[PDB]
Design a protein around this ligand. Structure first.
Ligand SMILES: *[C@@H]1O[C@H](CO)[C@@H](O[C@@H]2O[C@H](CO)[C@@H](O[C@@H]3O[C@H](CO)[C@@H](O)[C@H](O)[C@@H]3O)[C@H](O)[C@H]2NC(C)=O)[C@H](O)[C@H]1NC(C)=O
Ligand SMILES: *[C@@H]1O[C@H](CO)[C@@H](O[C@@H]2O[C@H](CO)[C@@H](O)[C@H](O)[C@H]2NC(C)=O)[C@H](O)[C@H]1NC(C)=O
Ligand SMILES: *[C@@H]1O[C@H](CO)[C@@H](O[C@@H]2O[C@H](CO)[C@@H](O)[C@H](O)[C@H]2NC(C)=O)[C@H](O)[C@H]1NC(C)=O
Ligand SMILES: *[C@@H]1O[C@H](CO)[C@@H](O[C@@H]2O[C@H](CO)[C@@H](O)[C@H](O)[C@H]2NC(C)=O)[C@H](O)[C@H]1NC(C)=O
Ligand SMILES: *[C@@H]1O[C@H](CO)[C@@H](O[C@@H]2O[C@H](CO)[C@@H](O)[C@H](O)[C@H]2NC(C)=O)[C@H](O)[C@H]1NC(C)=O
Ligand SMILES: *[C@@H]1O[C@H](CO)[C@@H](O[C@@H]2O[C@H](CO)[C@@H](O)[C@H](O)[C@H]2NC(C)=O)[C@H](O)[C@H]1NC(C)=O
Ligand SMILES: *[C@@H]1O[C@H](CO)[C@@H](O[C@@H]2O[C@H](CO)[C@@H](O)[C@H](O)[C@H]2NC(C)=O)[C@H](O)[C@H]1NC(C)=O
Ligand SMILES: *[C@@H]1O[C@H](CO)[C@@H](O[C@@H]2O[C@H](CO)[C@@H](O)[C@H](O)[C@H]2NC(C)=O)[C@H](O)[C@H]1NC(C)=O
Ligand SMILES: *[C@@H]1O[C@H](CO)[C@@H](O[C@@H]2O[C@H](CO)[C@@H](O)[C@H](O)[C@H]2NC(C)=O)[C@H](O)[C@H]1NC(C)=O
Ligand SMILES: *[C@@H]1O[C@H](CO)[C@@H](O)[C@H](O)[C@H]1NC(C)=O
Ligand SMILES: *[C@@H]1O[C@H](CO)[C@@H](O)[C@H](O)[C@H]1NC(C)=O
Ligand SMILES: *[C@@H]1O[C@H](CO)[C@@H](O)[C@H](O)[C@H]1NC(C)=O
Ligand SMILES: *[C@@H]1O[C@H](CO)[C@@H](O)[C@H](O)[C@H]1NC(C)=O
Ligand SMILES: *[C@@H]1O[C@H](CO)[C@@H](O)[C@H](O)[C@H]1NC(C)=O
Ligand SMILES: *[C@@H]1O[C@H](CO)[C@@H](O)[C@H](O)[C@H]1NC(C)=O
Ligand SMILES: *[C@@H]1O[C@H](CO)[C@@H](O)[C@H](O)[C@H]1NC(C)=O
Ligand SMILES: *[C@@H]1O[C@H](CO)[C@@H](O)[C@H](O)[C@H]1NC(C)=O
Ligand SMILES: *[C@@H]1O[C@H](CO)[C@@H](O)[C@H](O)[C@H]1NC(C)=O
Ligand SMILES: *[C@@H]1O[C@H](CO)[C@@H](O)[C@H](O)[C@H]1NC(C)=O
Ligand SMILES: *[C@@H]1O[C@H](CO)[C@@H](O)[C@H](O)[C@H]1NC(C)=O
Lengths: 122, 433, 122, 122, 41
């Protein structure tokens, strides 16, 4: 059922997230090629986990932020986005808005951690 | 039911049987010794032990994959050490041989051949006469002779700068794995045992390869132990581990000479010849009283298994190739084949004549042969017989057997087992989000 | 002291969990074999961490759930389980009850995250 | 800007932690050497993450403890440490105080988790 | 022993090859298909 949700709308698909998130980990020339494939799978996995860590979303399939949507990214109604789009269609719709969002998420989490230390410091 | 919830625990001290790759480890201490040049990261002198107070684990030495790994690793190391250095294809030529009789004892009269032949150093169609003595066992008649293996295999010269002298090797577990061992005395090598402890690295075991008699390695804790997979099955070998060594002194009392022959552009062949002084037969001495006492101990233990009201005897093995019928070891760098008929001759010093070969088909395979270069000077060595490999044919008869390289390691690795750590599990308890 | 707790009872052994959890990470043919061993150790480590993440137990050696014990798994008294059993004996006792529990844990965490988003959405 | 903060004081440098923490992950003989380098980078990364997990600092660039400073480690004023030292100078100042601190952090987290279970058990 | 359509297809080809570095070659013959053999009798 790995891509079973691919044709589902975003608000319907985001219930199967466990499956898609889970099935990522599953002596001459072929030996080295197989290792390269295994090392790569691990590296890709860790990069995604590190970003969730940085953004303050570690341990969650869905996480809230404190960074607002900036409109120019997309001006669609949220009911249009969640009910009339699949995640694949959506990714295409905003395929050009990547680090423009990620950098903001990183900045936000760093400020939040500083604020928390300043309060625990009191 | 009690409203207990599933609580998940990580770091749980449990395990399952598993097969993995163990790594070589050694001492901090041999410059061209393949066991030392195999790096074998130095072990930590401090054992962990960690006695497990209530652990009663199940062992089976006859299914120990650690033995299989050691066998495979030895072969691989051996083979890679032969990739460099000289190949001897050019020696597969007609030899003209005489019987070498100008300074011999009579028991050596038929052992050496003079063997003159034509070999070159340049692709100049300019061959030169080279002669080398050879042992009879390496040369087969076609006056004209050929080397014994030129009919079936490639011959590779052992590289003279490389030593195979056994250095005890410890096997160490990879992360996620642990080695468990029995500390019990009088342990079968099979079945459950209490007093199990943990091992990061095994004790060091010297990778000694021999036939019939088990050399060096280690001794039994109290009494000679008899272990077998199927004791009533005459198709199985019986491994007997002594609780005290029998000292054996072996020698090649011939002052030889290494003759360097140019065989190619940067390649040398090592010939032998012009032995200085009397030519004598190689032999082992075995202390006699010790041997007799040792058998008495073995016999007593065999009777516990086969009946204390019967009589058993020891026979001089059986027929077959020298690799099977004689005792084999290679101290000093040369390969010795000795007649154990002088030991296994009884019903309940001993000089054993020996023969030497230079062309060795390592037991593990065919299609290749190794040529052992001659050793300059003389050879003397002392070793500890620590056990036997026996088979059985009212009364009963036992014979020296073995020949399967794995029996020499299985006899040491009967105490260790490899397990995988699986530190995750659940249990019902009081723990609600 | 890695398996020092192996002979201890479950309620006694679960104090050394740090040690068992910690000591998991510690150019021809041997070169490739050693890499295979290292890659594998990493992969095994990550699979366990991913499950703890999925079940909502990330970052903890011991974590509570909201999934009840279902009796048929084991009908032993909790005092029998925690005081008269070692973890090894226990694992054998319930060795046949694995994904039967894990799937429930996965479902629970997903429902909980949805509920949390719906509340933060308010 | 990876080591841009290297010359900054500790209280100034600890704002760029995201960058230093983030840029850790970035067929014959060279094939095997490159894999060894990649496997190692992953192993080093995971060891640091495991320690943060063990100490109760997972998911944070900065985390508070319940283990006090023990004086003999350093008798400098905190204003001297945070304003008149760079992290590199500081690391040298206390370079000989490593597991002496880490073991305490491990013990603390284990006690805290036990206390939390005992309360959730109620 | 041929049909005529096969008349030009096989060559008998005798040659000198050895088994030892004895400068002792032996005659060996093998049939070959015409397509594998090119004229330099
Ligand atoms: C059982 O263990 C004994 C003791 O370790 C082994 O015998 C020992 O073999 C080494 C290697 O041949 C001998 O040392 C050598 O001495 C010559 C002298 O010039 C030197 O050139 C070599 O580099 C090396 O140092 C050692 O003395 C010898 N021990 C005795 C008492 O003679 C024995 O071989 C082992 N058994 C088997 C089957 O290997
Ligand atoms: C092996 O045969 C060779 C060939 O006859 C012997 O070497 C010869 O010994 C005589 C003795 O003076 C010399 O004059 C010859 O020149 C030697 N031949 C060569 C090629 O040098 C050799 O001694 C024999 N080896 C034995 C019997 O050990
Ligand atoms: C080398 O010595 C062996 C014996 O040690 C010789 O063998 C003899 O060969 C003849 C050939 O007809 C036999 O009749 C003899 O009976 C053999 N002797 C024995 C004891 O079996 C061998 O011929 C000698 N080789 C040379 C080159 O002289
Ligand atoms: C080395 O090569 C020489 C030259 O071919 C061999 O000597 C010949 O042996 C044959 C054998 O019958 C004789 O008919 C030739 O007359 C010999 N030639 C000469 C120049 O003597 C020689 O025997 C080869 N060496 C060996 C050990 O076989
Ligand atoms: C065979 O061994 C004997 C004993 O070592 C050698 O005989 C001695 O040779 C030296 C050489 O100068 C003489 O000085 C001694 O007097 C010899 N001994 C006797 C008792 O005469 C003999 O030469 C060796 N033979 C060969 C072919 O090497
Ligand atoms: C093997 O050789 C050694 C010497 O290299 C022998 O050791 C001697 O044994 C006698 C026995 O009473 C002792 O008195 C000597 O002191 C020993 N020599 C040394 C140097 O200690 C040993 O016995 C030999 N073994 C056999 C089976 O003969
Ligand atoms: C043969 O067995 C004897 C013991 O019967 C071994 O002697 C050991 O030698 C080492 C050398 O320092 C000592 O440290 C040990 O304590 C000795 N053992 C005993 C029981 O005293 C001898 O090394 C053995 N030989 C071989 C080749 O293993
Ligand atoms: C093998 O058969 C072929 C024909 O099948 C022979 O070819 C002939 O070669 C001669 C050479 O002068 C030509 O004149 C003929 O016209 C060729 N025949 C054809 C049909 O082209 C060939 O010579 C034969 N080889 C042998 C060894 O007899
Ligand atoms: C195999 O080798 C022999 C020996 O050299 C070849 O026979 C020679 O062929 C040449 C060619 O003209 C003749 O001059 C020689 O007189 C032949 N020698 C003998 C002893 O007959 C033979 O032809 C070779 N085989 C092949 C298929 O070429
Ligand atoms: C596919 O599109 C149709 C269009 O109405 C929709 O009804 C259907 O549910 C879609 N498939 C999925 C998986 O949602
Ligand atoms: C030559 O090799 C064959 C291989 O089967 C062997 O049987 C034969 O005995 C060998 N020749 C001699 C003289 O041993
Ligand atoms: C020890 O070996 C004997 C041989 O008959 C066997 O019967 C016995 O059960 C073995 N003991 C264990 C513990 O396996
Ligand atoms: C030896 O093997 C035979 C094979 O059937 C078996 O019956 C016998 O019991 C075995 N002996 C022991 C002691 O297990
Ligand atoms: C065996 O004992 C005899 C007795 O004289 C001795 O000469 C010989 O050298 C001994 N051999 C070995 C290998 O010790
Ligand atoms: C055992 O001794 C007898 C005595 O004649 C001999 O014939 C037999 O071949 C010997 N056995 C072996 C394996 O050497
Ligand atoms: C072993 O010694 C006996 C004694 O007669 C002899 O017959 C036998 O051939 C010898 N075997 C070997 C392999 O030397
Ligand atoms: C076995 O012992 C007897 C007793 O005299 C002896 O005659 C016989 O030769 C011995 N066998 C061997 C192989 O030495
Ligand atoms: C062998 O003979 C030579 C001749 O001088 C001598 O120097 C050498 O030491 C001898 N080797 C042995 C082991 O006796
Ligand atoms: C081993 O079992 C005995 C049985 O009473 C128990 O007292 C002891 O504490 C156990 N060992 C451990 C480590 O708990
Ligand atoms: C370098 O040291 C000077 C000394 O006063 C300081 O003012 C300056 O800010 C330092 N550089 C950084 C990056 O802080």
């Amino acid at each position: 059922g790995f891509l079973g949700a691919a044709g589902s709308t975003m608000g319907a698909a985001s219930m199967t997230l466990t499956v898609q998130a889970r099935n990522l980990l599953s002596l001459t020339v072929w030996g080295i090629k197989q290792l390269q494939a295994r090392v790569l799978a691990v590296e890709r996995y860790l990069r995604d986990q590190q970003l969730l860590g940085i953004w303050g979303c570690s341990g969650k399939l869905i996480c809230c932020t404190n960074v607002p949507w900036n409109s120019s990214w997309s001006n669609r109604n949220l009911s249009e986005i969640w009910d009339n789009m699949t995640w694949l269609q959506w990714d295409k719709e905003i395929s050009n808005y990547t680090q423009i969002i990620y950098g903001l998420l990183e900045e936000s989490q760093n400020q939040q951690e500083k604020n928390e230390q300043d309060l625990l410091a009191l | 039911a009690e409203n207990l919830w599933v609580t998940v625990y990580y770091g749980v001290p449990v395990w399952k049987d598993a097969e993995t790759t163990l790594f070589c480890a050694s001492d901090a201490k041999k410059k061209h010794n393949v066991w030392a040049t195999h790096c074998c990261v130095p072990t930590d002198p401090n054992p962990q032990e960690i006695h497990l107070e209530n652990v009663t684990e199940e062992f089976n030495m006859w299914k120990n994959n650690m033995v299989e790994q050691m066998h495979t690793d030895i072969i691989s190391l051996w083979d890679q050490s032969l990739k460099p250095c000289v190949k001897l294809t050019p020696l597969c030529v007609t030899l003209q041989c005489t019987n070498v009789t100008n300074n011999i004892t009579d028991d050596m009269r038929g052992e050496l051949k003079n063997c003159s032949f034509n070999m070159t150093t340049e692709l100049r169609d300019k061959k030169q006469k080279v002669y080398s003595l050879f042992y009879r066992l390496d040369v087969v008649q076609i006056k004209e002779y050929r080397l014994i293996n030129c009919n079936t295999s490639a011959i590779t010269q052992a590289c003279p700068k490389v030593s195979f002298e056994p250095i005890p090797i410890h096997y160490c577990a990879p992360a996620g794995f642990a080695i468990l061992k029995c500390k019990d005395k009088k342990f079968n090598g099979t079945g459950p045992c209490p007093s199990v402890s943990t091992v990061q690295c095994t004790h060091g075991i010297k990778p000694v390869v021999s036939t019939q008699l088990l050399l060096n390695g280690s001794l039994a804790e109290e009494e000679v132990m008899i272990r077998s997979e199927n004791i009533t099955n005459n198709a199985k070998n019986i491994l007997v581990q002594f609780n005290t060594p029998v000292q054996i002194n072996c020698t090649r009392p011939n002052n030889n000479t290494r003759k360097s022959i140019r065989i190619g552009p940067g390649q040398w062949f090592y010939a032998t010849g012009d032995i200085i002084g009397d030519i004598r037969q190689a032999h082992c001495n075995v202390s006699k009283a010790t041997w007799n006492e040792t058998l008495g101990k073995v016999v007593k233990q065999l009777r516990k298994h086969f009946g204390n009201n019967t009589i058993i005897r020891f026979a001089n093995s059986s027929g077959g190739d020298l690799e099977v019928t004689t005792h084999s070891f290679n101290c000093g760098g040369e390969f010795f084949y000795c007649n154990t008929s002088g030991l296994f001759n009884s019903t309940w010093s001993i000089t054993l004549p020996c023969r030497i070969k230079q062309i060795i088909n390592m037991w593990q395979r065919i299609g290749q042969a190794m040529y052992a270069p001659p050793i300059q000077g003389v050879i003397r060595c002392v070793s500890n017989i620590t056990g036997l490999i026996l088979t059985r044919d009212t009364t009963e008869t036992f014979r020296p057997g073995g020949g399967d390289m794995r029996d020499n390691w299985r006899s040491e690795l009967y105490k260790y087992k490899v397990v995988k750590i699986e530190p995750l599990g659940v249990a019902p308890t009081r723990c609600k989000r």
